């Protein structure tokens, strides 16, 4: 059984699925530029 | 890459000397034989897979022995590499005329080359019917210009020359 | 969503200056390609499927990705390779109108290599595939026009990457 | 299969399953065991079903095998008979799952597509199909002769 | 080594093309200013034993404890060492600006710099300050603002390769800091 | 008709926009004001909308 | 027989370069041969003597001004009455050779400092060096420089004709003596002042101590660490700058790294070690399905053969032939070029790419976990819940001991 | 390095005893098969050019994206080196079944290929998969059943080589993972 | 380094000139001696190349066990940390000699430090003399009392800002010990 397996449902699909974790469209979690470098600790000057 | 950019740095380098006036005026002529020696990159580029059929089934016309079973080109897998290896060496003809020099033919296809096609039992006077046969097919003032059919053939016999 | 004429017009205005010499002297030099790209763009239209068809025979077509497993075995996802691989030889050709490669990550590249990860396409033979099809096009539109052509080609995939 | 659209037939109209169709996902699965007999006739016939499927198609559409055709040379003609042992399987899977739903996402789905950009005349792998069918329907009874023939026409139907 | 001829064969044997003709505008364009490229070249190794001079001594008046005892310009023989890495610095810098890559910079002078300059002891941002200056002196050499020498040279545009030289001491400033 | 909205069909397919999204883009389509806008009036292109 | 004969024999008799010197990687970069010719222009002879210079020092700063033993050994060489051997012999017993690498060096340095400069090779085995040891403690270090390049290593790799080079052989008598070689002449930059550390040891770069490393692997069997192959290395001198799909080069070590990003990476190259293990057993059979009928459809296809051009007429039509050894078979451009697209393709290469892109992604962070106490961490990821215990109370793995005090 | 008499010395050597008649029961047998063990080396010297072939080639049918531009194994150079390497690893295991000790394998070939392939970027995988077509071949060979070529042989029994040269090729594989 | 003294922001679209809601009071008033004390910093790190390399072997030569072969600095990787750390904690004074305030100095380069030295077998006794000739040679470039090196300062006094560096070098030297 091929290891790239793919996303979606219904027949032609691989047992995972859509997206791989059923969200086609991800809402994104990251942050903004000044304070994705505030969480980092290290960007405290800049 | 052995190219006229890299014979005058590697050897500029080896002395410890800046590019002085002897090795500028070497590029002089990278601007007016590079007015033709890509244009056989060019034709040769949107004409390659027309060419590579045209001289590959002369290497099984001329020998019609290799379809037979036990030699090279025996199957269907075989054949189709051996139609690969032509595209090759069609491939590095056109990287060596837009680098300059040899440089392509010499790391990439011809190094090793002695030890490949005695070990794997190809006939290497089988590669040289193909591509001595693309030099014959060469029409020079209709395939390119006359200047760059000169180029693009000087390439061609000295991978030939390589083979044999 | 920029040409070449309203990059060169945003620059200048985004100053508040008029169209000195040095703006002047870009828009002059599209307009030389002007006939160029239309030209360019008129064979792309043309020859549409059949670049398409020669790319993916070039490329992917029998590696394993096509066979059962693959990423590409159903025919729902056959078919909409080259329904994808529609628009990279369509937006492609917009960016070589216009000049600009801004309508390409505006409506392409976005969301895209995004987006991929999420079905689980393999971006490396995506990749592959408008190499493929770039190097095609440079048959048809000639080798500057292949170079114009060419220059956006490998800007979708350099951010697809 | 008759039982997943048989669900998404109900579960978009807000409520559960009528006797309409709860009597015939009853029906369907004491027809199972009749099913799985069918599909194993034509599970262990793909030697004689496709190449005999191949058979006809080349004496009815000579173009396509002859220099020229899109199924030319020994490569081709290996790829012509392969698509028509797809589609057997497919037949295969529609048997047991009761409908062509597994032959509709797959093989019939925007198949056009595909062949139109393949080369391949699409009215020629009908013709391929519909030889199989003819040496499908040879090789069982005339109760499952109506079953087996009548998934290889529904892919006749979608195919052109 | 590679040139800006086989950078473009190496890039297009990883898409295992043929160098068509989107490719060759890219060095059809090179070869068009090819005339220009050798007129910047001969504005570096024309003043390249002065510009030594000038852009290590500019990193003893700012770092003086360099030639302080115990430095790293205090013995001579030490002191003769810091002449000659400014110049086949500026020997390596000019061969990438001959060729248009900057492969032979990265495979022959940074190959192994950085754990050298360690090695050796060498203070790594003064290094910097020796690489910088001949950054600040090729781009007035090659646009020709040199506030004290001026060349004679055809007149038209030239701040791509101002450009490319700057990118270059970049390459050899960021491999050993 | 053979008619094709490839670019919605994928954008709703993967979930990229809404039906909604896809519905207001075909709204905004040629292919419908040219079938249920152009041969008709303003009055009753509010009422077939 | 890919490779007939070694470099330590000599070239017989009919080829310019030896058969293990041509697909190595002696053809890319500047570790060949500038042998001298017979008579020579006296710019042509300061070719030959730079190249001594950087060879037998290696990259050492000569300091040009003084030259001061050297120029009598300069002109016995510019006469011609003095080899190549013979001049390589006798800068190797001057001072200006003794105060570089032997008056601060240990012996084990100064003995893998001749294998560098006067041979090609590093040492390969631990009682080679056990011979050079007895031979200078014995015999003084004038008889030893004479009996270290009159053996019969020198006379046949180089003759009395070339000058010395890194000889990139081939063939490796040891696996190691690869991974030492590429260790000791450090990259096209580093000198052996810089490598064994006689400047930053010497008061004012003067005097100072030859320390050595790598004096562990010559004693017990143990291979270099890769991180001194790979990064300050000749290999990338003479790279190839190919296309290489996995890139040999290693990434520059990454400031904070995290335990949580290598213990999802090292379950990352176990899933796809685990699959390749698994789809390496299905390969070039099961995975054509084109494969099975290859006996039915080239048999079939074997109607109706056409000796000359213009056949299959077809019901009076031009339709004609192409009769080549490819379209016979029915192939075309896209049937020979569909090997040279197998990277993005292929299912088993699909999975041996990412294997050694994600594990020299790992075998870098994993070795820059060698820093621990004061270093300055960072959370680049969003602080997901996804964490693994610290349970490590009792014994879980215990490597076998089954001869706890045995006695 | 040491052969299959010298093992049982250095063994012996260690609580300094003669070798006595109790240890001897080995080597006395070791020479009573001794003619089956120049029998068994013959027949894999004798096919050893064409044993490299079958193998290099047979990893490249099961991973064909080696000779894609990018694998491992692609240009002249990389092919022709990768059967230098087949045939190096095939030579030291024909040297260690006819010592009968794998102490000439573990010190000069395969101490320290495992760093030497992480440098050069060759996939260790698919090393394994060059080996393992070396090991099924040799074991074949042996005993006489390779499916294309008989040899002369005399009759009786050779499992036993066919075993200890199956263990040179696993030492091969747990060398360089 | 910037953050030390605070910018005021006069443009439009910041966010900060209009919808700061504070101004930096503390840092307000550091420029009320602000002159004086960069004065300070730049006469430290001008010396800054030579003050590392006489403290470091200041210590070699009164502590003679160091570059002793099975001493704590007689290789050269651990030679070449060694001065690379004395580089950096003169940096993390000039922090905060700059800052005006040692909250700089006990997190980034004193938090676990002394766990460190004891975790590598680094000789406390003697980095601790090491970090007292950099508090004596810091107070006599400050003051422009050094003895081979003035530097043309304004006509002033700085001393309470020589006492004040030299409250951050055993701030660092008691954070060790
Ligand atoms: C980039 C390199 C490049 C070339 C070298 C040519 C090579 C070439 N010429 C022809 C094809 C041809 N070549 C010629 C020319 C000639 N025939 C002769 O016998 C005379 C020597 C010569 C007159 C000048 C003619 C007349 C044809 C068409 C008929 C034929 O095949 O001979 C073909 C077969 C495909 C085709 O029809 O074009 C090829 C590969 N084309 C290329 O793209
Ligand atoms: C970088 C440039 C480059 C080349 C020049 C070729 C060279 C080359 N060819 C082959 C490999 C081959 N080459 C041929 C070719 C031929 N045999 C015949 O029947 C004819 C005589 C001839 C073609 C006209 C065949 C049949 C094989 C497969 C050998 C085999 O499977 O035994 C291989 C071994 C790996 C493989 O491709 O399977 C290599 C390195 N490949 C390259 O990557
Ligand atoms: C091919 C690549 C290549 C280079 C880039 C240079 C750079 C270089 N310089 C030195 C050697 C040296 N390099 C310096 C240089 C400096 N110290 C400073 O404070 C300044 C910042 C800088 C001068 C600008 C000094 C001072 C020495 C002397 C060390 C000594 O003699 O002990 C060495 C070690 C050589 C040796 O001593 O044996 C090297 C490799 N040489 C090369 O071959
Ligand atoms: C404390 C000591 C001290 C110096 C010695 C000078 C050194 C110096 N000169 C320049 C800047 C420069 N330096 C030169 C170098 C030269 N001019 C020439 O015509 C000759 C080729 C060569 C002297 C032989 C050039 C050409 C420039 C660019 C501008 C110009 O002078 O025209 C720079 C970089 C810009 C800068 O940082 O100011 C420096 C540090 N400055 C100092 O602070
Ligand atoms: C063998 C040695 C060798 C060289 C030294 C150069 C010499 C050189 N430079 C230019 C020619 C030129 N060089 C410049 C370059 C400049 N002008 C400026 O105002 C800037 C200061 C500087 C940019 C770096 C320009 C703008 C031209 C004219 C346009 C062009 O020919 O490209 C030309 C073409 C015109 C002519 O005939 O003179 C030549 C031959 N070429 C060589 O073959
Ligand atoms: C003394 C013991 C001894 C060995 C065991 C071998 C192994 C070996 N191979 C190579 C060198 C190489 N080895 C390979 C091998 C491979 N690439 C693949 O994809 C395959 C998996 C594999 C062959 C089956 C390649 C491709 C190179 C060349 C890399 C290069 O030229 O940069 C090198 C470096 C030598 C050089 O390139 O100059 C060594 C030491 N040689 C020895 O001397
Ligand atoms: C993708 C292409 C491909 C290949 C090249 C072969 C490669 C190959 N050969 C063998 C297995 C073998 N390979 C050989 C090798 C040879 N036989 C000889 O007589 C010669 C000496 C030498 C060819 C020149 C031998 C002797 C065996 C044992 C069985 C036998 O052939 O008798 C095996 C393991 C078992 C198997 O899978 O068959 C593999 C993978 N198989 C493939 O799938
Ligand atoms: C100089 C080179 C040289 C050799 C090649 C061998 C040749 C050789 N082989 C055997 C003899 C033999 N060889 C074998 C071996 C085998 N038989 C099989 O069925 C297996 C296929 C294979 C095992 C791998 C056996 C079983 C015998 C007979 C028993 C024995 O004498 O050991 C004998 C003893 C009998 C005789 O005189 O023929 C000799 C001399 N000895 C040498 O000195
Ligand atoms: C931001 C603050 C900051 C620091 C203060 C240093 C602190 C520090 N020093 C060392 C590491 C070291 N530090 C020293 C230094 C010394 N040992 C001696 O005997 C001398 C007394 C003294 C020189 C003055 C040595 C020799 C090592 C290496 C230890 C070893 O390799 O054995 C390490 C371990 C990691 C490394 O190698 O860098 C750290 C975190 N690094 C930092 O990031
Ligand atoms: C045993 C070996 C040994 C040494 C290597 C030196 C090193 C050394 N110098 C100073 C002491 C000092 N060191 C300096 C440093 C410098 N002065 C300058 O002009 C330069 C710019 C810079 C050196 C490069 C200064 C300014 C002082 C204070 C005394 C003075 O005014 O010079 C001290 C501390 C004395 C004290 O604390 O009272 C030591 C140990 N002394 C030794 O006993
Ligand atoms: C399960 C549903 C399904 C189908 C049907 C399918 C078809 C399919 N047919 C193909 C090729 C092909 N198919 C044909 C077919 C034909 N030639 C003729 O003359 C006949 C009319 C016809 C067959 C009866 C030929 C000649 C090719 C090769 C075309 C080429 O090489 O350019 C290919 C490309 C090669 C490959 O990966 O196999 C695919 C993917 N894939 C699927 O997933
Ligand atoms: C205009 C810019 C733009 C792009 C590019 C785009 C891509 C896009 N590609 C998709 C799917 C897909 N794309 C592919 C493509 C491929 N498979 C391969 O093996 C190849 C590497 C590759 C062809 C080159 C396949 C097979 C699917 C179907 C995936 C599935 O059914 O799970 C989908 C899901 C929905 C649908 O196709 O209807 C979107 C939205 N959308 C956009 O708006």
């Known amino acids: 059984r091929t290891a790239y397996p793919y996303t979606g449902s219904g027949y032609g699909s691989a047992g995972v699925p859509y997206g791989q974790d059923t969200y086609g469209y991800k809402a994104t979690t990251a942050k903004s530029i000044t304070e994705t470098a505030a969480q980092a600790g290290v960007f405290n000057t800049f | 890459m052995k190219s006229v950019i890299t014979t005058v740095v590697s050897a500029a380098d080896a002395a410890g000397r800046f590019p002085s006036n002897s090795d500028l005026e070497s590029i002089q002529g990278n601007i007016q034989r590079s007015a033709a020696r890509l244009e056989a990159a060019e034709k040769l580029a949107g004409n390659h897979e027309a060419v590579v059929k045209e001289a590959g089934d002369a290497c099984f016309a001329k020998y019609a022995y290799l379809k037979n079973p036990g030699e090279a080109g025996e199957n269907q897998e075989k054949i189709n590499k051996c139609y690969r290896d032509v595209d090759h060496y069609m491939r590095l003809v056109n990287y060596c005329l837009v680098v300059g020099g040899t440089g392509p033919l010499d790391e990439w296809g011809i190094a090793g080359a002695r030890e490949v096609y005695r070990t794997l039992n190809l006939p290497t006077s089988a590669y040289v019917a193909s591509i001595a046969y693309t030099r014959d097919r060469l029409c020079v003032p209709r395939d390119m210009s006359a200047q760059a059919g000169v180029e693009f053939s000087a390439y061609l016999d000295y991978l030939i020359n390589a083979l044999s | 969503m920029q040409d070449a004429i309203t990059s060169v017009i945003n620059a ?136 114009e052509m060419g220059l956006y080609f490998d800007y979708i995939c350099s951010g697809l990457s | 299969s008759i039982v997943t659209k048989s669900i998404v037939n109900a579960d978009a109209e807000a409520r559960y399953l009528s006797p309409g169709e709860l ?129 290889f026409d529904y892919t006749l139907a979608a195919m052109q | 080594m590679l040139d800006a001829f086989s950078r473009v064969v190496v890039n297009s044997d990883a898409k295992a093309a043929y160098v068509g003709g989107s490719d060759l505008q890219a060095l059809k364009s090179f070869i068009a200013d090819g005339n220009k490229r050798l007129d910047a070249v001969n504005s570096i190794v024309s003043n390249a034993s002065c510009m030594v001079s000038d852009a290590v001594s500019g990193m003893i008046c700012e770092n ?17 060492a810091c002449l000659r890495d400014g110049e086949i610095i500026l020997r390596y810098v000019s061969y990438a600006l001959l060729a248009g890559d900057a492969s032979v910079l990265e495979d022959r002078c940074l190959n192994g710099l950085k754990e050298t300059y360690i090695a050796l002891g060498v203070p790594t941002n003064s290094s910097i300050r020796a690489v910088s200056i001949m950054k600040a002196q090729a781009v007035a050499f090659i646009t020709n603002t040199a506030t004290e020498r001026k060349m004679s040279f055809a007149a038209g545009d030239c701040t791509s390769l101002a450009s490319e030289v700057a990118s270059y001491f970049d390459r050899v400033g960021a491999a050993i800091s | 008709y053979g008619f094709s909205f490839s670019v919605l069909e994928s954008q709703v397919k993967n979930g990229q926009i809404s039906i909604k999204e896809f519905v207001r883009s075909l709204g905004k389509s040629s292919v419908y004001q040219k079938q249920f806008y152009q041969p008709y009036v303003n009055s009753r292109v509010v009422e077939l909308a | 027989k890919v490779v007939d004969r070694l470099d330590s024999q000599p070239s017989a008799a009919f080829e310019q370069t030896k058969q293990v010197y041509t697909f190595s990687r002696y053809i890319l970069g500047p570790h060949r041969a500038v042998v001298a010719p017979v008579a020579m222009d006296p710019s042509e002879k300061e070719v030959v003597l730079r190249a001594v210079y950087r060879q037998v020092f290696g990259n050492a700063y000569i300091m040009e001004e003084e030259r001061a033993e050297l120029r009598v050994m300069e002109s016995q060489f510019l006469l011609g009455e003095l080899s190549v051997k013979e001049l390589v012999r006798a800068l190797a017993k001057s001072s200006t050779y003794k105060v570089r690498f032997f008056e601060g060096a240990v012996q084990y340095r100064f003995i893998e400092l001749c294998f560098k400069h006067l041979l090609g090779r590093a040492p390969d085995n631990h009682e080679e060096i056990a011979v050079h040891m007895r031979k200078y403690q014995q015999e003084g270090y004038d008889a030893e ?171 009076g039509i031009a339709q004609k032939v192409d009769n080549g050894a490819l379209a016979q078979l029915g192939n075309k451009a896209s049937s020979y070029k569909k090997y040279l697209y197998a990277i993005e393709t292929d299912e088993v290469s699909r999975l041996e790419v990412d294997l050694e892109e994600a594990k020299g992604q790992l075998r870098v962070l994993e070795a820059a976990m060698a820093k621990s106490t004061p270093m300055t961490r960072t959370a680049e990821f969003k602080t997901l819940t996804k964490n693994v215990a610290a349970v490590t109370a009792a014994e879980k793995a215990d490597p076998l001991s089954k001869r706890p005090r045995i006695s």
């Open chain 4, 23 to 151: 009597d015939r996902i009853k029906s369907f699965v004491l027809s199972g065991q009749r099913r799985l007999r069918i599909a194993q006739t034509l599970t262990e016939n793909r030697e004689r079903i496709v190449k005999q499927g191949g058979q006809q198609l080349f004496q009815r559409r000579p173009d396509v095998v002859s220099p020229g055709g899109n199924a030319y040379g020994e490569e081709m003609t290996a790829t012509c008979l392969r698509d028509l042992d797809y589609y057997l399987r497919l037949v295969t899977y529609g048997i047991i799952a009761g409908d062509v739903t597994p032959i509709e996402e797959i093989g019939l789905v925007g198949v056009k597509e595909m062949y139109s950009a393949l080369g391949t005349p699409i009215s020629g792998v009908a013709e391929g199909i519909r030889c199989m069918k003819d040496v499908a329907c040879s090789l069982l009874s005339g109760e499952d002769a109506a079953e087996v023939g009548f998934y």
């Open chain 5, 64 to 80: 003086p404890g360099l030639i302080s005892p115990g430095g790293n310009c205090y013995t001579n023989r030490r002191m003769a």
């Open chain 7, 145 to 315: 420089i004479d009996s270290y390049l009159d053996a019969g290593e020198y006379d046949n790799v180089f003759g009395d004709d070339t000058v010395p080079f890194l000889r990139f052989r081939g063939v490796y008598t040891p696996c190691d003596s690869f991974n030492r070689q590429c260790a000791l002449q450090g990259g096209w930059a580093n000198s052996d002042k810089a490598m064994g550390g006689a400047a930053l040891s010497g008061y004012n770069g003067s005097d100072g101590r030859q320390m050595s490393t790598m004096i562990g692997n010559y004693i017990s069997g143990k291979p270099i660490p890769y991180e001194k192959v790979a990064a300050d290395t000749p290999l990338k001198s003479t790279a190839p700058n190919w296309y290489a799909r996995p890139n040999p080069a290693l990434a520059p070590q990454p400031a904070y790294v995290s335990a949580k990003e290598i213990a999802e990476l090292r379950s990352r190259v176990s899933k796809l070690e685990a699959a390749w293990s698994v789809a390496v057993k299905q390969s070039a059979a099961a995975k054509d399905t084109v494969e099975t009928w290859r006996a039915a459809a080239k048999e079939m296809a074997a109607m109706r053969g056409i000796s000359p051009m213009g056949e299959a007429y077809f019901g």
């Open chain 3, 12 to 147: 200048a205005d985004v100053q508040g200056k008029y169209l000195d010499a040095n703006s002047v002297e870009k828009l002059r030099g599209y307009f030389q390609t002007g006939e160029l790209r239309v030209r360019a763009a008129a064979t792309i239209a043309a020859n549409a499927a059949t670049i398409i068809k020669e790319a993916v025979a070039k490329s992917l077509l029998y590696s394993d990705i096509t066979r059962p497993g693959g990423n590409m075995y159903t025919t729902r996802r056959y078919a909409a390779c080259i329904r994808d691989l529609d628009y990279y030889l369509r937006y492609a050709t917009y960016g070589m109108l216009a000049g600009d490669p801004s309508i390409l990550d505006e409506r392409v590249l976005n969301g895209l290599k995004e987006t991929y990860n999420s079905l689980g396409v393999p971006i490396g033979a995506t990749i592959q595939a408008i190499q493929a099809m770039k190097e095609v096009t440079g048959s048809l539109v000639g080798s500057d026009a292949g170079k």
